[PDB]
Design a binder for this molecule. Structure first.
Ligand SMILES: O=P(O)(O)O[C@H]1[C@H](OP(=O)(O)O)[C@H](OP(=O)(O)O)[C@@H](OP(=O)(O)O)[C@H](OP(=O)(O)O)[C@H]1OP(=O)(O)O
Ligand SMILES: Nc1ncnc2c1ncn2[C@@H]1O[C@H](COP(=O)(O)OP(=O)(O)O)[C@@H](O)[C@H]1O
Ligand SMILES: [Mg+2]
Ligand SMILES: [Mg+2]
Ligand SMILES: [Zn+2]
Length: 420
């Protein structure tokens, strides 16, 4: 026998940084995959928060809003919040099967700064302009790298795949009930130069439940990936934009990708991509994962056009939008909470993403499994995982900014359609 320190919360010192590599990133988090050898972190990624350079856990109204869970609102810092929110809110609605909720790790302000320097190269100019890494969390989250187990993993950020029916949408905003917000949004994204090409994808095809509308969706995506489609080869990008959105696939990158699916997809040159896509579509349609998700999203029972009102009650500030419908203000404050919390929850579900791993059975290391795909026209069997990512809680305050963003979306669409 020998004597060792008692147990202690691991801490990531200013030396472990060179173990991590740039993965991707959103508006809210950094993500780096693991390159070092320590068994603990192998097959893991670190999700490190950043700070918009114009910047306690929960505001007073957010405490009351999420109060139905004492452990949640009493979160020290945002990693526990992130943990408890997936743990006691999301998985109840979503099921633990396709979420792999996260583990905290302490980190030194020095470690962060080291990662911050190490990625800036791989990061997109305007992401560097808009946010460095937030070097005053003590913590960060470690997750299973949902592109591992050759392993081909594809990521789909579906967005909201239903159309509202609220009695509070106005005649003028009548389009909102027949055009997905995603399509209209695209117009506003084009005017602001954030894409080059209106995207072929319509999340209605994905959330339709038609094994045939879904393949169109997956076909659309590969065509115009923007920032909703990504395909990896063992932790590397091969289709999609890294940390950002990317222009329509071209003849040159489709012929590059194509010659990449070599030896994973077994089909003659110029046939693998149409195969790979059938595979993705069938993983998505077969796993049924996309269904329960669209149930969460539909906790938007009133659309932001009606929900904003309940928001102004919550924060007990007189309602701007009204102009002298009591109906929504005459609610008991308790009911007005439920709509806004269910709104926020729904927001988590429209902004989340799906990762799908693959292990071809044409490789001898094949650990079979009851979730798999048999791709009829090449005779290959593929075992696959489907997991969620970016189930972050959203701030009560984005409500106001949500309403404004909606207004501009349906105002601007109405516009370009009046032209004709
Ligand atoms: O950058 P991404 O990783 O893609 O995600 C960003 C936002 O996430 P946050 O980082 O939490 O803000 C996301 O959710 P929000 O927080 O706004 O609810 C937005 O969705 P929407 O605004 O609701 O439509 C995104 O817009 P679309 O991707 O076009 O949906 C995008 O905004 P950006 O372009 O300014 O970064
Ligand atoms: N657990 C994970 N496994 C593999 N890739 C991930 C994981 N988490 C995030 N990523 C990748 O890094 C990106 C970071 O985004 P995300 O974690 O959703 O934070 P944000 O709030 O910034 O959108 C994702 O779009 C995803 O492709
Ligand atoms: Mg994201
Ligand atoms: Mg997020
Ligand atoms: Zn009102």
């Amino acid at each position: 026998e020998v004597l060792f320190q008692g147990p202690m919360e691991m801490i990531l010192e200013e030396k472990d940084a060179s173990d991590w590599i740039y993965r991707g990133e959103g508006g809210a988090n950094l993500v780096l995959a693991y390159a070092g050898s320590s068994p603990l972190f192998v097959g893991k990624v670190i999700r490190i928060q950043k700070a918009r350079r114009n910047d306690s856990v929960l505001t007073s109204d957010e405490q009351h809003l999420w109060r139905e869970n004492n452990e949640l609102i009493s979160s020290p810092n945002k990693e526990v919040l992130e943990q408890r929110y997936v743990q006691n809110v999301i998985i109840p609605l979503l099921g633990p099967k396709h979420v792999d909720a996260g583990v905290r790790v302490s980190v030194s302000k020095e470690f962060l700064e080291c990662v911050d320097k190490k990625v800036t190269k791989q990061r997109p100019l305007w992401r560097v302009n808009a946010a460095n890494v937030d070097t005053s969390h003590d913590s960060a989250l470690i997750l299973n790298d949902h592109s591992l187990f050759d392993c081909i993993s594809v990521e789909i950020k579906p967005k909201c795949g239903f159309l509202p029916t609220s009695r509070f949408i106005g005649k003028e905003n009548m389009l909102k009930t027949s055009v997905s917000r995603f399509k209209m949004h695209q117009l506003l994204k084009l005017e602001y130069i954030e894409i080059s090409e209106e995207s072929e994808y319509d999340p209605l095809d994905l959330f339709s439940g038609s094994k045939e509308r879904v393949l169109e969706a997956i076909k659309a995506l590969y065509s115009t990936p923007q920032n909703n489609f990504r395909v990896f080869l063992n932790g590397s990008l091969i289709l999609g934009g890294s940390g950002e959105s990317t222009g329509r696939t071209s003849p040159e990158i489709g012929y590059a990708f194509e010659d990449a699916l070599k030896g994973f997809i077994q089909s003659e040159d110029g046939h693998r991509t149409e195969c790979f896509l059938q595979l993705v579509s069938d993983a998505v349609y077969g796993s049924g994962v996309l269904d329960r998700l669209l149930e969460i999203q539909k906790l938007d029972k009133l659309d932001i056009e009606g929900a904003i009102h309940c928001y102004y009650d919550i924060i007990n500030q007189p309602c701007p939008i009204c102009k002298e419908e009591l109906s929504l203000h005459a609610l008991p404050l308790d009911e007005s909470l439920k709509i806004v919390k269910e709104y926020l929850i729904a927001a988590t579900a429209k902004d989340c993403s799906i990762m799908i791993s693959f292990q071809s059975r044409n490789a001898w290391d094949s650990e079979p499994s009851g979730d798999y795909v048999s791709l009829k026209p090449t005779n290959q069997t593929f075992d696959y995982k489907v997991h969620f990512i970016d189930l972050s809680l959203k701030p009560l305050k984005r409500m106001e900014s949500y309403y404004k963003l909606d207004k501009k979306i349906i105002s601007f669409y109405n516009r370009k359609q009046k032209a004709e």
